[PDB]
Structure formats: structure tokens, C-alpha cells
Chains A and B, each alone.
With several copies, the nearest count.
Chain A
Amino acid sequence: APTWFYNTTNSEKLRELQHVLGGSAKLGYLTAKVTEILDVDLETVIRAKAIAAYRAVRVPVIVEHGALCIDALNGLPGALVKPFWESLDTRLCEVIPAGQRTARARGALCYCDGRERHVLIEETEGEIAPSARGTGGFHWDPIFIPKGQTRTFAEMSLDEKLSFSPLGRLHTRLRTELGL
């Protein structure tokens, strides 16, 4: 029987997690729907999802949230990844000016056993792409290019993305802290 339960609702975030932490016998998987807080700060959102998800499942839970922060939009989308994705899918590469393209992709995990929350945050500095390129990802992976490469996240494979994406360094940190 597991000890920690990862709660997610996106079907592709689950497939990338189980590619990395799928063999661990002490990680379970739940799909409880919790009411998403909306805020620009990633530290605020991920710390409030852990209360909202512990109330739903009442087991030691792990939650996840992402953020895209563009310097042309002065920190927006931020942790508002739901209302921009429901309005600008990948047309968000058009609505920002073409002179300054730099942005930062950020991710956060928070695990809560009921007594205390612990937040892990990674971050990748990159720059937004001129047009949407690629299929293999979720939410903005066709329009984000990390610093150093010429290639987007969705143009990469799954092993290539998790060596650059923020959610790849978090899942290695989550393995060693929880002993998964």
C-alpha cells in the first residue's frame, strides 16, 4: 500500500510522472477535483492547493502547479495558467511583442501529510518561440525554448524534456526527500 498520493487532473502530467516515479511502490495516484485558487504568485497557489487537496482526500497528498512568467507581460501569465490557456492556447506567442522574447518556466510541488507543508520549486530560464512548434507536451511546451537550445519542449522527446523542464528536476528531488 502507498504512503503518499499524488493528486492530479491533467492526463499528460500524469503520464510524465509515471515515466519517472512509476516504479515506486509507495506512491499512489488520485484524481480528486479540487477548486483551483487563481493568483499570479506560484508560491501562493501551490501552498493553497495542498490545503484544498488534503481536505478532499484526507491522505498524505502531493500537489503540483506550473507557472509561465514572461518579461514582456511583466510576470504574466504567472501562476494563472488556467485562464490564459482557456483563452490563448498557443496564440500567446503572438500577443507579446517580437523584440523582447525572454521568459521563465517555473514549477512547484507541495506535499502535505496533515501537519506541515513542504514546497519544492524549480525554474528554467528560456525565451518564447515565434510560432507553435511541436506536439509532445502540455499547456505551453510548443512555444517555450530553454536557454541554450534551438528546440522547443514539444519538439523534444520525453527524456529530453525532463532533463530541461522544471517538472523533471522536481521529481528527482521528490524521490530523495520522500524516499520514493
Chain B
Amino acid sequence: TTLTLSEAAPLLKKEFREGRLIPFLGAGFSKPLKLPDGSQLIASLAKTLGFEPELFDMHGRFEQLAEFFAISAPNRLQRLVYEMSLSFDSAEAEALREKSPMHRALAALDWRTIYTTNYDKHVEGALRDAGKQAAVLASFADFQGPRARDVCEVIKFHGTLDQPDTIVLTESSYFQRMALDAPPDQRLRADLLANSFLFIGYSFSDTNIRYIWYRMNQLREQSQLGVKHSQARRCFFATHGAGLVQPDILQQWNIDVIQLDPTDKSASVARLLESIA
């Protein structure tokens, strides 16, 4: 129950010719950019509170340690968003983004809507390197602004570093995004009615994208509760290690798992995006 590269290539091409394919890009898409972890950044900020860096990481997950800065030392949480903006969007990360085959193969296609969950600017900046125009959509003021219909709309699902009050990084902010009331969430509610999604750069043990995978399936079934049940467009999830139990769970959430070649992570994603063209 797992597609290969050559099997999923005519399936993704049929969704793209009629304009109903939306990428949903994760943290693994920014892996060739050699960015800092963020868990390493939050551990070095804990030295001022008396923590050793290996000891502060012991007391919980990354969003839980950011919850601790949000309530006990709020000036260090704003310091964390500050030095991620210097690191994730540095000039060295732009130079790797010029030569990355993943970001070139993404920008070679005329997308209409691209979703991403990472905070850096390298999804839009890939489109600017190909001479294409992109529109960042993170806050309410971004949707209200005018733009052309030719411009690909890149919705920052968890905020952008140039709008620091849109960042979803504290644990309480992840819990209140489960109600789906943010402006990126309301845009997702209408796009799942018409489109198929291509999830790239996630793991099966994320537990945040798994709730989103569940909730998209529940909103598709709720949208056809009184009418006869019609068949929906299949979503897709590109993986390098699929496992043996998790692709069967994802199939009931309207998501087909694509096994990519695990020898070179960046090349096999680039061959997937070039087979759509």
C-alpha cells in the first residue's frame, strides 16, 4: 500500500494539469539549507537561567520548553525569535537556496497555492529566484492586501519571522490552533473542498500534522453528510522511510504514501517535483 516514484508521477501530473495540487511543505524541506535546530538555540539561551544545555533539553519537548520561556522569562522567548530570524534567513542560507535542487524544482512549476509550516522565507525566495512573484499570507492584514491572480499565494501556516506575533511555537499556541480559527486555518477549510495536497518533509511521529491529517478527513466527510457520498481527490505524502503500519493508517485519512529513495534525501524529492512537470 505504498506508491513508488514512477507510480505516483502520473497521479500527481493529473492533479497538476487541472490546477488542483497544493504542496504542504514541512521542516524537512529546509533540511539542505543547513539551518540551526532551534532546540540547540533554546538550550543556549537557558545558560542565563542556570541550566546546562543537555540538562534543559531533558525537561520536555521543544514546544514545552518554549512554553517555559513564555511564562517565566518572556524576554528570552523574544530573543529566541530574534536569533532565529538572523539564522534561518541569513545570507548563507540564501546561497544554499540558490543551488538547492529541491527549491529549483519547486519553483519550476506554476503553482497557485503553496502551504508551508516552517518560519523561514525560503519557500517564497525560491520563487523569487526563478523570476516568479509570490505573496506571503500569514496575518489578517496580508489577506486584505491586493494582489494579481497570476501570483502564487504562499500561506505561512505557522507564521513568518517578519511578523513575530504570528509565530506558532509555544505549546499553548499549538493547542489553540487545533480549533482551526486562525486565518491560515480558515483558508485551509475552503481549499480542502476542491484540492489535493502533497505533504513533503514530515515524520510519522510529529503528532501535530497527524491531527491536521485527521481533521482534514473529518471536514471532507462532514461536507457530504446529507448528499450521497462521492469520491474525493487523494492526497499524497512523500516519505523516505515509510515503515509498515503507518501507510495503512494514512490511507484511511485520504492520503497515499510515496516511497522515495532513501540514499540521497534531497535528490529523490527533486526527482518527484520534476516528474510533475
A62 proximal to B (CB < 8 A):
no
A5 at interface, CB cutoff 8 A: yes
Give the contacts of A1-15 with B (CB-CB under 8 A): 1, 5
**B98 interface residue per 8 A CB criterion:** no
Contact with A along B237-264 (1 / 0, CB 8 A): 0001111100000000000000001110
Once the chains bind, are A115 and B55 in contact (CB under 8 Å)? yes
Q: Does B95 contact A (CB under 8 A)?
A: no
Answer whether residue A114 sits at the interface, using C-beta atoms and an 8 A cutoff. Answer: yes
Q: C-beta contact mask, A85-122 vs B, less than 8 Å → 1, else 0?
A: 00000000000000000000000000011111100000
CA distance A153 to B240 in the complex (A): 38
Closest Cβ–Cβ distance, residue B214 to chain A (whole Å): 21
Query: Is residue B4 contacting chain A, with contact meaning CB distance below 8 A?
Result: yes
Cα(A28)–Cα(B262), bound, Å = 9
Known: A1-B4, A30-B263, A114-B59. A57 touches B241 (CB 8 A): yes
A29 x B58 contact (CB < 8 A) = no
Any chain B CB within 8 A of the CB of A58?
A: yes
B40-55 contacts to A, CB under 8 A, are 50-52, 54-55
Given contacts A1-B261, A54-B58, A57-B262, contact A115 B4 (CB under 8 A): no
Q: Contact between A115 and B244 (Cβ–Cβ < 8 Å)?
A: yes
Residues in A neighbouring B241, C-beta threshold 8 A? 57-59
**Docked CA distance A55–B54 (Å):** 12
Residue total for A at the interface (Cβ-Cβ under 8 A): 17
Q: What is the CB-to-nearest-CB distance from B234 to chain A, in angstroms, rounded to a whole number?
A: 22
> Could you tell me the distance between the alpha carbons of A115 and B262 in the complex, rounded to whole angstroms?
20
Residues of A within 8 A of B51 (CB): 115-116
| Complex contacts, A167 vs chain B, CB 8 Å | none
When the two chains form the complex, which single residue of A30, A58, A59, A116 contacts B50, counting CB atoms closer than 8 Å? Answer: A116
Contact, CB under 8 Å: B52 / A115? yes
Which residue of B4, B52, B240 is within 8 Å of A116 (Cβ)? B52
- Given the known interface contacts A58-B242, A59-B241, the answer about A112 and B55 at a Cβ–Cβ threshold of 8 Å is yes
User: Using Cβ atoms and an 8 Å threshold, which residues of chain A touch B58?
Assistant: 51, 54-55, 114
Per the bound structure, the CA–CA distance linking A54 and B51 in Å amounts to 14
Give A60's nearest chain B residue, CB to CB: B244
Q: Mark B33-70, 1 if CB is under 8 A from A, else 0.
A: 00000000000000000111011001100000000000
A114 — which chain B residues lie within 8 A by C-beta?
55, 58-59, 243-244
Nearest CB of chain B from residue A137's CB, rounded to whole Å: 27
Cα(A112)–Cα(B51), bound, Å? 11
Closest Cβ of chain B to A76, distance in Å, is 28
Alpha-carbon gap, A33 to B52, bound state (A)? 24
* Given known A-B contacts A114-B243, A115-B244, A59 and B55 have beta carbons under 8 A apart: no
Mark B99-141 against chain A: 1 for CB-CB distance below 8 A, else 0. 0000000000000000000000000000000000000000000
Chain A residues near B263 (CB-CB < 8 A): 5, 28-30
Contacts of B52 in A (CB 8 A): 115-117
CA distance A19 to B244 in the complex (A): 31
With the chains together, A54 CA to B56 CA distance in Å? 12
Q: Which of B1-45 contact A (CB under 8 A)?
A: 4-5
**Contact partners of B50 in chain A: CB under 8 A:** 115-116
C-alpha spacing A81/B58, complex, angstroms? 27
Contact with A along B220-244 (1 / 0, CB 8 A): 0000000000000000000011111
**A116-B55 in contact (CB<8A):** yes
A8 CB to nearest chain B CB (Å): 13
Instruction: Determine if A58 and B55 form an interchain contact, defined as CB atoms under 8 angstroms apart.
Output: no
The distance from the CB of A51 to the nearest CB of chain B, in whole angstroms, is 6
Apart from A58-B243, A59-B241, A114-B59, list 18 A-B contacts with CB within 8 A.
Answer: A1-B5, A1-B261, A5-B262, A5-B263, A28-B262, A29-B263, A57-B241, A58-B242, A59-B242, A59-B262, A112-B55, A114-B58, A114-B244, A115-B50, A115-B51, A115-B244, A116-B52, A117-B55
Q: What 3 A-B pairs are tightest by C-beta distance, nearest first?
A: A58-B241, A114-B244, A58-B243
20 A-B pairs within 8 Å (CB atoms) are namely: A1-B261, A5-B262, A28-B261, A28-B263, A30-B263, A51-B58, A54-B55, A54-B58, A55-B58, A57-B241, A58-B240, A58-B241, A58-B243, A59-B241, A112-B55, A114-B58, A114-B243, A115-B50, A116-B52, A116-B55
